[PDB]
From Swiss-Prot, chain B:
Full protein name: Kinesin-like protein KIF11
Residues of the full protein shown: 18 to 363 of 1056
Illness: Microcephaly with or without chorioretinopathy, lymphedema, or impaired intellectual development: An autosomal dominant disorder that involves an overlapping but variable spectrum of central nervous system and ocular developmental anomalies. Microcephaly ranges from mild to severe and is often associated with mild to moderate developmental delay and a characteristic facial phenotype with upslanting palpebral fissures, broad nose with rounded tip, long philtrum with thin upper lip, prominent chin, and prominent ears.
Subunit structure: Interacts with the thyroid hormone receptor in the presence of thyroid hormone. Component of a large chromatin remodeling complex, at least composed of MYSM1, PCAF, RBM10 and KIF11/TRIP5. Interacts (via C-terminus) with the kinase NEK6 in both interphase and mitosis. Interacts with RARRES1 and AGBL2. Interacts with TPX2.
Functional summary from the UniProt entry: Motor protein required for establishing a bipolar spindle and thus contributing to chromosome congression during mitosis. Required in non-mitotic cells for transport of secretory proteins from the Golgi complex to the cell surface.
Superkingdom in the source lineage: Eukaryota
Family: Belongs to the TRAFAC class myosin-kinesin ATPase superfamily. Kinesin family. BimC subfamily.
Entry binding sites for ATP: 86-93
Lineage of origin: Eukaryota, Metazoa, Chordata, Craniata, Vertebrata
Cell location: Cytoplasm; Cytoplasm, Cytoskeleton, Spindle pole
Length: 324, 329
């Protein structure tokens, strides 16, 4: 029920100057195949909900996985997309993207743009003149060493950690004290909010060891919706989650995520949500009422074989998770 | 002889609201900076420098007044170096590199927040394309962290790979960094992507190395080979170099290069016969910029906050002593 897709990254310039890809993707068979030994070899094979080869562009990812998810958010559902995988495989690439070099494109037209910018820009486009009044708010909550950080609040620095509490009102919910929600009033406000995030992230990285590889980041967008004739109320939420790299100090949230998934697929009565910040904040995305997808990202380099195999096995198990 | 300038940064968002009151007064006409060390009724310390720039100073004021006269020297065939020195948080990177105005408001070559490096490269092409000059520009970015050396512009190697340094056998007191890449910049439409590539590699450097942005020293080098032909058919072959150095934060891991830089300045001001250039990577790379044949400037960056009093005094004292260093043959 949880939707699991595989994305392979392409080779960097250093791998050319010349590397052989050990990963073969077959989208129509929806399968990924890894070469483990070597004219004559052994291979490992996995079927996923969708597979995306090294030639896949950002627009292909958005149109195939995000577009249907965003339609469901607009319908009034909560959705979550995780990116999972080894550092270096394209978790941030997929979730955020990058800017094309030399100011070639405006941010809205940049084909290297990832899920977060494309989504924000499309919400405004989809709801431009249907019967739906709406507002958009975003937050970016991050977890490093089991501490909480607000990367969007422009009035306090990143030494300041946030406090998490059980929410009495709705069970299995939490309240993050001091977490800021920025109203995104229109498309022309999006980019600078994203820039503020990047700036504060650069501060985080100088103060915290391997921040960009070791932190989990949860970019949340909330769409409040109202249609008329009588007022019909829709609230849509989407979490865009860029996990800490899965490579094997200790990452309690990452360890706990794995153990939660294990419990859910084995149908164990006890599921250890409370054992980390990440699984408490996202418990509804794991066997709850939220529609969830996982993008498992992998490398094509034979160097990365073991971690590529670990990610695939991990992601494949997760296919068996049921929610809603 | 080494020219020392002070740049006070403005107050940020978080302090203007806390109604922050500057302990720092800048008097550019009198080339002076005044610090309230006591704090209606106060005590003050006063320093005269070669140039002083208050909180109101823009990037273009810095360029026009300090950089354009030095670049003219580089175009003439001299080697020149500019250092930024000061506490983390004071504007060393803002001064040397600049930032982007938010929301894609401007192109890179018109951005008011652009710093020394992009302004210089844009202008080299502007200055030498205008008159009659065949020229070539080569750039390199060498960074020192934990006394190891990194090439932050090589787009064919990652930052695990540190370079080796050697004495240059022929020209005495020079150095050879093995493997350091020089990237030719053919035109001004090629500047921005190269700068971006450096920023990308820095991001990875920061992930791998603790407090990389605060603890590293970076040397951005520009080399201009010029074949000017005058209107009378006179041909000049000139080669100029400019090193734009963003030093590690001066606040009080030992930083051998930062420690050695201070001791080199002490030796050169007290006129001591032995100058400990050889005691660090930085002072070996830049030894000619410290009592050598290179014309050098230091830009000391400082904060207006009363909270930063002790480090602000430290910076000013450090920078003021540097005024007494002579170079050039
Ligand atoms: N699909 C892709 N297309 C082009 N480049 C990619 C792709 N995926 C990853 N990369 C490159 O690989 C590098 C590492 O990707 P990144 O997103 O930072 O990985 P991670 O977030 O998993 O550590 C980046 O420089 C990025 O440009
Ligand atoms: N002259 C200035 N004008 C406006 N903002 C500045 C100035 N100098 C520094 N800042 C701001 O203060 C912060 C610290 O700047 P930065 O260059 O990172 O300091 P350093 O490199 O010395 O640690 C940045 O957010 C920067 O935008
Ligand atoms: O092509 C892009 C268009 C818009 C945004 C993005 C990236 N994504 C996100 S989330 N934040 C940031 C991005 C930029 O690279 C750097 C600034 C922050 C790429
Ligand atoms: O306004 C700017 C115009 C051009 C360049 C710059 C900055 N400076 C230098 S050296 N590198 C980089 C800058 C950018 O902000 C980010 C990319 C790298 C600012
Ligand atoms: Mg990443
Ligand atoms: Mg800096």
């Amino acid at each position: 029920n949880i939707q699991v897709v595989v994305r392979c990254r392409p080779f960097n310039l250093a791998e050319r100057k010349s590397a052989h890809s050990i990963v073969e993707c077959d989208p129509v068979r929806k399968e990924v195949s890894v070469r483990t030994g070597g004219d004559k070899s052994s291979r490992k094979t996995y079927t996923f909900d969708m597979v995306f080869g090294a030639s896949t562009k950002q627009i292909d990812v958005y149109r195939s996985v995000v577009c249907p998810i965003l339609d469901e958010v607009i319908m009034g559902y909560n959705c979550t997309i995780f990116a999972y995988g080894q550092t270096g495989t394209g978790k941030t690439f997929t979730m955020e993207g990058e800017r094309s070099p030399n100011e070639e494109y405006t941010w809205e037209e940049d084909p290297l743009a990832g899920i977060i910018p494309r989504t924000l820009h499309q919400i405004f486009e989809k709801l431009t003149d249907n019967g739906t009044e709406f507002s958009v708010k975003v937050s970016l909550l991050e977890i490093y060493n089991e501490e909480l950080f607000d990367l969007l609040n422009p009035s306090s620095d990143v030494s300041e950690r946030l406090q998490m509490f059980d929410d009495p009102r709705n069970k299995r919910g939490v309240i993050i004290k001091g977490l800021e929600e920025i109203t995104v009033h229109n498309k022309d406000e999006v980019y600078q909010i994203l820039e503020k995030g990047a700036a504060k992230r650069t501060t985080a990285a100088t103060l915290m060891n391997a921040y960009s590889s070791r932190s989990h980041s949860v970019f949340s967008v909330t769409i409040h919706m109202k249609e008329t004739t009588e007022e019909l109320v829709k609230i849509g939420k989407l979490n865009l989650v860029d996990l800490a790299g899965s490579e094997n100090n200790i990452n309690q949230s990452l360890l706990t995520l794995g153990r939660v998934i294990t419990a859910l697929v084995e149908r164990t009565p006890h599921v250890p949500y409370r054992e980390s910040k990440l699984t408490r904040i996202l418990q509804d995305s794991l066997g709850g009422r939220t529609r969830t997808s996982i993008i498992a990202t992998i490398s094509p380099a034979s160097l990365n074989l073991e971690e590529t195999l670990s990610t695939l096995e991990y992601a494949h198990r997760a296919k068996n998770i049921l929610n809603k």
